[PDB]
Amino acid sequence: RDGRHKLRLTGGKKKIHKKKRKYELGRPPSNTKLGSRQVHVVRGRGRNYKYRAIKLDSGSFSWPTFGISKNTRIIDVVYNASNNELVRTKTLVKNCIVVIDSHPFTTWYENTFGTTIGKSKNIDPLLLEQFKQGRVLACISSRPGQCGKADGYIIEGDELLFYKRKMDKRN
């Protein structure tokens, strides 16, 4: 599997000897979808344990601008940076764009500052407009296939504008 038995830098067909070694691995790939939390333990080399989430729904989501996090159910997968197949199939992967249920954050803000740490950084109107309708656009950052949970952050400013334009000239 890993690291040999593909063509020479010159374009040549390099010969093979040295039968595949276990320390190569190349373990079988895992999708992971949106459903009810279900995770499998994997035993990696040297007794490194890894967590294979095969379905998830409830993550740790961070509002970066205020440095605070709440746990939230994730409503749907809406855009993927790479292939359209993953988003179509409703499967999570690291850099994917999901939508989160914003009631925890809304509740936090009202409790803390009032109105619907380093105080008063004043939201953004586009983000605020999304916020009223109660389900908000977020980027997963952690690796589900490694860490057994999917953790992410609310999109902001320029990054927000980019994803909104790509996601939805327009078909």
Added chain:
Amino acid sequence: GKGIKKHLKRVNAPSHWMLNKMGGQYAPKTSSGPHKLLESIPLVILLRNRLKYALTFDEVKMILIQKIVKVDNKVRTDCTFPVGLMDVIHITKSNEYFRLLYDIKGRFVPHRITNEESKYKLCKVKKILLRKGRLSIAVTHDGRSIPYIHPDVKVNDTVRLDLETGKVLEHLKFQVGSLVMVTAGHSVGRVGVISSIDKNMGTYDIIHVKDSRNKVFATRLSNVFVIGDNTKPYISLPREKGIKLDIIEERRNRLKA
């Protein structure tokens, strides 16, 4: 399979073990432990091949079962346990204390030491790590971990260490006026004063060392062991006092006895 290699051929073993060609086929392989394989001796070699208190490995086992050997103030029990670059061997039946030192040819001799100086050792720090709660710890070439070290002590500074408490008594700066002992380079087993330091970006650092006969040689920083300050060596040096005769003179001396 393709695991770790546990055997060691007698020929493939280090030259400074000083084993013969024809004595069987396999050496003692040192167990893993506080000093590197290539930079120690296994306790079997020390007892049988150097001191000569055993003629066989079996006699070494018989000696070892009896808790009459102590290295570093504590009893040891495995034959293949490492002697270490600087340590105190204590043989309790005959009340003998040895400190281990290099000669001037490049091998380890067990050197007869008084009871009073036997209660301390010299430890080079290899690293200094900052651990949780902002508490420093130093890491020694003696495999030993040093909690709560002075911030005044840095990586090439050596430290005098008690054996009862494991705590530091004092330290010797690696300042360019300090006695240095050569540990593994081509000129291993010498003492000099540190002439000069040359610092090279991204690469090995070399230090120029001067002998008591005013001969100069250079050596790589990795293998340099501070051994005292300009007044005296802080432990008692063996017979030739770290000073190396040149071959012609050595042969001339040997004849002229």
Added chain:
Amino acid sequence: PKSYRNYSKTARNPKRPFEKERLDQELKLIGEYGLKNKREIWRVQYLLAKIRSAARYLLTLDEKSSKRIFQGEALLRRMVRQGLLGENEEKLDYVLGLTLPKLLERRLQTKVFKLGLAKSVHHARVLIRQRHIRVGKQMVDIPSFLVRVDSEKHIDFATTSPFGGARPGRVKRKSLKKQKEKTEA
């Protein structure tokens, strides 16, 4: 696995087999020093040649050179121990000057023949094989032992030899005579 004990050729075969002048010379040398085979001459020749090669290499190196002074002196001291060079000579060109009769002259059989004991070179060679000789403190049967200068002073008879006064004569004849005398009387 293969043994780590080393081994080497003593001698080198001579090249150009039938060269008359060399061949007759070798026979002449055998005639003087009592050697069994051309092989004995060849080993001695090889030994001399190695010394000559070493000395030649040394003399190429410059004077006052550290390696040169050390090794040259050491080799020369070894020659003094062997008794190849006299006291007055002490320089590498007398090492080059070493010559094959001079080396043969330091064989133990030769030394015995010179000192006495035997009445012939051949007599000396059989005497040495038949265990009558002693270098003092040690006994030897090898006629190709070479004598070192400090050991030329202690050539003797073996103390367990007849000439040392051990078992004193021919057991057969003395017993036969004694039995006959007792019977007769």
Added chain:
RNA sequence: AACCUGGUUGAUCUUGCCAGUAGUCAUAUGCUUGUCUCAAAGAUUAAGCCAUGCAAGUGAAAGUAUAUAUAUAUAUAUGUAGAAACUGCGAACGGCUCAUUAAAACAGUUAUAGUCUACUUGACAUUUAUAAGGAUAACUACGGAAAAGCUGUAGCUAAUACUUGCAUUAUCCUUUUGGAUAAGUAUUUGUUAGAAGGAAUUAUAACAAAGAAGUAACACGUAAAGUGUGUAUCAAUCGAGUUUCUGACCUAUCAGCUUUUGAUGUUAGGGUAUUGGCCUAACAUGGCUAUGACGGGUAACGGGGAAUUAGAGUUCGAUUCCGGAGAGGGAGCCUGAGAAAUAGCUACCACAUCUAAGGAAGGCAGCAGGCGCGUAAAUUACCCAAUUCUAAAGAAGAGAGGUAGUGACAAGAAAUAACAAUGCAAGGUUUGUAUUGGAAUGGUGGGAAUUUAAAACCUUCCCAGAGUAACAAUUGGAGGGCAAGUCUGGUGCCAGCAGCCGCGGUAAUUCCAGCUCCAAUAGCGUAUAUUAAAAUUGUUGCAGUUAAAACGCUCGUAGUUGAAUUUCAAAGAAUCAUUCUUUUUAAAAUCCGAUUUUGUUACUUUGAGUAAAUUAGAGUGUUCAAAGCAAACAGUUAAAGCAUUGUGUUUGAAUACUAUAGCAUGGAAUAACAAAAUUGAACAAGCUAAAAUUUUUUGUUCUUAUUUUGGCUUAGUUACGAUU
């Protein structure tokens, strides 16, 4: 020891080969073989096939014993053993082969700021309890199947196996102390703050989220308070994976290869222990190539190294060490720290054993031993004593390993007479040699002493014990090359010999004998390969008018090679007449009128850091040598030294080499290269925008203002600026 001879001819000189010669840790084979030491040995052919046997286990304070046995004190107390079995740890090392494999693997040289790491070492931990839950083996009973290291039930019972789970410490304030408050290790996310390394998105510190896993419900009896076993994190360590640089055999009658099926890159993922086309998607359209890519060949594992060498070199390296690869051929997997493991497993194909035919079991390139293949190779040995390994580690295991047996593979030492008398021989009392005749001795036979895991050998001693010293030396030769026969018979161009020239047709210096002689000698022939000889592969170091060989001629790309020129000298001391060494002599910057820095690279010098064995080499009377890595010294038993009534003492195992590449380092010459005028500077002056310095408006904090330093725009001023 830096070496040459015979053969073109009537005779000659060349060119040129062939022939001779020697070696070959390089195989075979023929004859012969007495000693002793030393010791390679089914690799070349078939990585062909294998009968039988053996080759990995493990419990001496310390997880588990109502199988069972047992000793003391009064059924009871202690204990001591303990078959059996669970559990634990190993069995992933060793050992073997060399098929594969030609930038691969390997060697030096980096990197790991891209990671994993059992045993061992040292630091050392956080959100019912006078003691918790079962269920299982051995074991008991009934069983089944021709047979397997097959296993079915049901009843039991333990564990350091499996599974639960019990406080308490730290932070801030009055001020020893009195109050208040906090309290998850890795790991992962988001947010920031920031002891060291050349460089940090590093150690680390805080905030907001998640979060494994743990921190003893365990066993001994240790010090006149301790140990074992398990255990989170860190470090160390035995290491492992990737990974930088540079280095290879033959072939152009292999010249364009590589990219749909990842080739080269970019982005994002997934995957990994981690980096990466490692793998998916999307996007680029590249990457490599006559300085030989891409193919083909290899009777090719690589290297340490080996043989041969005057110096260059040339060939060889299955084979002691290191590294790689593989276990009939392929493939896939489990367990565990470590495996794509082969005396683990599953399947296929190719083989193949037992079977009552239903099914079962199999893998010697472990060691023996067999068949086959062949030019070509040993005992179904004995032993774990040493050497080491593995274990719950003394005490058990190990065909790892040692020791023998077989052994003319190689290598060292070394007999096969010696000697005196006479007689004879030759010489100027001599030297030599067929008669005699007393000494010397292994080999050998026996006994020991000893050696040894045990025996045998070695050594040593005591008996026996040579004269045709039958206790018997052979092999190949005797024209030339080439050292020794124009000796004697037989054959008669036949038989034959003959590396080569040639010999053999009736005197054969060559055949076949015999006699004599000669070379080497317990060794000597023969074959095939290989090195020298071969300056006949030629860098050193060939030849090309005519002997082999100048392209028909010219242009020309790659290649190789390339004029001159920029800093000359002067003075002092040593030494034997020279040599070696020191001082000063332009210009700028920099440091307190004095003090010290100044292109790049090749090249070269030193160095550094280099596995041993090998190899060169110092030391060392193994009986000598091949060797080994040791040893030496005094002492009929004590002196002597030095320890404060005691203790042997000196010791040796050096040194060098370990590519050309990489690393540091002094450098004047030699080379390159950089810098270099249809123009480029260097400085002094002035204005301008950036930074520093001083000040500071106002009821937890927003300003403003002068001054000083680097960058930029604009006239002047300099030995201003270009080698022949």
Added chain:
RNA sequence: AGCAUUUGUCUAAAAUACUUCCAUUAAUCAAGAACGAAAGUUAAGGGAGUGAAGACGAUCAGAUACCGUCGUAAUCUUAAC
């Protein structure tokens, strides 16, 4: 390689001479290219002499040869090879 009548036109060339200019621009060159006698080929002309083939007459034991008489192709220009 090759080049010999006359004159013209278009071309190149070398030496010399040069107190003329440039300033190393060079030397030899695998790859590749230009030219390349004679014969031969392909195509158009052209065709005197010469003359492989061939035909005869001789010479010779024989003669497919030397010698002789005749005689196609080629030899010449253009255009390719």
Added chain:
RNA sequence: GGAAAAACCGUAAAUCCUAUCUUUUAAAGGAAGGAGAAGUCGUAACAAGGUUUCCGUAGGUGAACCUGCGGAAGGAUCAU
């Protein structure tokens, strides 16, 4: 909580079909080269070898060869 069983991607053994390459190897007949003898036919070459040789080329021939065309001297001339 969980044994049997299945389906899907993914590893992917193996079997067969083609295709090319590789390797020896058969084959009537053809046509070479050498080796062997005293066989046949010539007279080609060496002398001006009885037509100077030899080259390149083309045609012919029983073969050695002969002839054309243009070269060379290694020619038999270094020369009115």
Added chain:
RNA sequence: ACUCUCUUAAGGUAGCCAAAUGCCUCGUCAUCUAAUUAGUGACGCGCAUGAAUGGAUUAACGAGAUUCCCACUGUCCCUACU
């Protein structure tokens, strides 16, 4: 090969083959096939081949002549049903 001989205007050259050309003839030898008067390659004293009456070879092309091989089938075994 080489020689003699009668004789022609000249005596078949380069080629080619039992060919749509060969009587003798189902020529002799191979090969294809299980069996070959067929196919193909050779051989060639050829009843009676052969050089613009064209000879020899040919890529492409063919409602052409000929043979074999693969695929395929009621052509056939052996017919039946519709």
